[PDB]
C-alpha cells in the first residue's frame, strides 16, 4: 500500500518533526499538495531531532512524506490516530536496511496547533 | 479512565518529546517506575518544542505523563499505537483552563531507539 | 475528555459492530447527528457479537457511541485510527465496573463500506 | 513491511471477526504460533461479518491475518492501537484489487475477553 500520504483539512496549519535512528544519514522530503515545502537532513542512532517545522497543509490538504539514504527511497509504514476526535497525530516510520525496526527515521505531524 | 500510563517493555531507551499550544506555561512530568525523571517547562502558542529527552523505562516499564499550568492539572487523552508490530508511538493530549483543546501541550513518546 | 463521539465524512455508509465482555446486560445506543438511530442489547462473556447495522453519517456526520447497563452510564475509552489514509476505525471500550478490563462492550465503526 | 502480523501476550483468549467488502469472494486465514486455527469465507459489499471466533494465542502469542481471493493474496494494511493501557485491538485492511479501499476484508482482532 501507499503509506506516508495524508489528507489534512484544508489550510490548516501543523507541525512535522523527525528523528533519527539509523547509521545512515535520513533525507526526509514534506510535500504538501506534490510540492515539495520542506527537507530535514540528518544523521543520529540516540533520536536526535533532524526537523522541526510549521507548515501549512493548503488547499487540496495532502501532505506525504518520503525518505531517504543516500539516494535509495526507504520503505514506509504509516497510520494517523485521533484522540478526543480534535488531535491528530500522522505517524510514519522508515527503513533503510533489514532488521526492520523501522524507526531509522521516524517522523510525527500534529495538528491543530495554537 | 486514567490517561497518560504506559507499560514499556522493561530496560527500553526511548525519547520523550513535548510541544506547546497554549498561553499558558506547560510544565511536563515524566515518571519513570513512579519517579519524575524528567520536567519540561515551556511556553509556546505555535508548537514550540518545550522538551526532548531519551530516558529508560527501567526494571518495571511504567511510564507516566502528568500536565499542569500555574500548578493546576490538565485534563489528558491518551492511545498507544503500534506499527509493523514494532514501531511504538504513546501519545498523549492535554487541555488546560486557558484553551479548550487537547493541544496544550502534547507529548511523544517512542520507541525502539537507534 | 469526551469519548465515543467521531466526525465521519458527511452521508457516508459506515458499519457499527458491538461484542459484549461482561456478566451484565449491555446496552449500546448509537446516535447519528444527535439522534439515537440503533440500540443494541445484550450479554456474553466470551465476546459475542450483540449488533451489528450498516448506517449512514448523514450531514453532520456525528457519531456518538453510549454504552450503559440497567440505565448505569459505563466509563468510555476511544480512538480513532487510519491506515493507509482510507481505511478507518473507530473504536469504544467501555467499564462497567471496577476491574478496569474496559472490554464490558467494545463497539468498532469501520468505513468505508462496498 | 510485514503488516497483518501481531504479538499478542502469550496464554491469552482473543476475538477475531471479518467483514467484507467486496465483488470478491473473500478467504481469511488466522495463523497462532504459525499453525492455521480459523477460516472465514465469504462474500458481500456490505460489511456482512464473514466470521466470528474466539482463540487463544498459545505460548508464543504470534498471531497473523492472511487474506486471499481466488488464492491470490491481498495487500494488508494494519496497526495496533491501545487504550487505557490495557483494551487492545489489532486491525488489518486488505485490497484484492486497485482501487485501493483496502476495505475488501476487514479484519479486528480484540483483547482481553471475558
Ligand atoms: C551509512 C550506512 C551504514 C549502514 C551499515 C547502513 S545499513 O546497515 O543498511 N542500515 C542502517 C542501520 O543503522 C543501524 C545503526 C540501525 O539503526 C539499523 O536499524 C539501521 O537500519 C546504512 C543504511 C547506512
Ligand atoms: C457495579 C457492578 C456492575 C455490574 C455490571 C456488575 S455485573 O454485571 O454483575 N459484572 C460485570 C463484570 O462481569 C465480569 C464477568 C467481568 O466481565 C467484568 O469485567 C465485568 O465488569 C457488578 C457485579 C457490579
Ligand atoms: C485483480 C482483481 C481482483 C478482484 C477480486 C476483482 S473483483 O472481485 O471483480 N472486484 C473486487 C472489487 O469489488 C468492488 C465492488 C469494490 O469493493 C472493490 O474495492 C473491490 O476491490 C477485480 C475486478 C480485479
Ligand atoms: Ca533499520
Ligand atoms: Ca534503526
Ligand atoms: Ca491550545
Ligand atoms: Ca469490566
Ligand atoms: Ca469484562
Ligand atoms: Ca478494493
Ligand atoms: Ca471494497
Redesign the interface.
Given at each position: 500500500?501507499?503509506?506516508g500520504?495524508?489528507?489534512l483539512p484544508a489550510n490548516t496549519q501543523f507541525?512535522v518533526?523527525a528523528?533519527a535512528?539509523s547509521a545512515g544519514t535520513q533525507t526526509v522530503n514534506v510535500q504538501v499538495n506534490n510540492e515539495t515545502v520542506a527537507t530535514f537532513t540528518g544523521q543520529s542512532?540516540?533520536?536526535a531531532?533532524i526537523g522541526?517545522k510549521?507548515l501549512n497543509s493548503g488547499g487540496g490538504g495532502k501532505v506525504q512524506i518520503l525518505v531517504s539514504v543516500n539516494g535509495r527511497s526507504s520503505?514506509?509504514?504509516?497510520?494517523?490516530?485521533?484522540?478526543?476526535?480534535?488531535?491528530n497525530?500522522a505517524?510514519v516510520?522508515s527503513?533503510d536496511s533489514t532488521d526492520?525496526?523501522?524507526?531509522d527515521a521516524?517522523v510525527?505531524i500534529?495538528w491543530?496547533?495554537?
Open positions: 500500500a501507499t503509506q500520504v495524508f489528507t507541525g518533526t528523528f535512528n542512532t540516540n533520536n531531532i522541526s510549521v520503505d514506509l509504514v504509516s497510520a494517523q490516530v485521533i484522540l478526543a476526535n480534535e488531535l497525530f505517524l516510520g527503513e526492520n525496526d523501522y524507526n521516524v510525527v500534529n491543530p496547533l495554537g
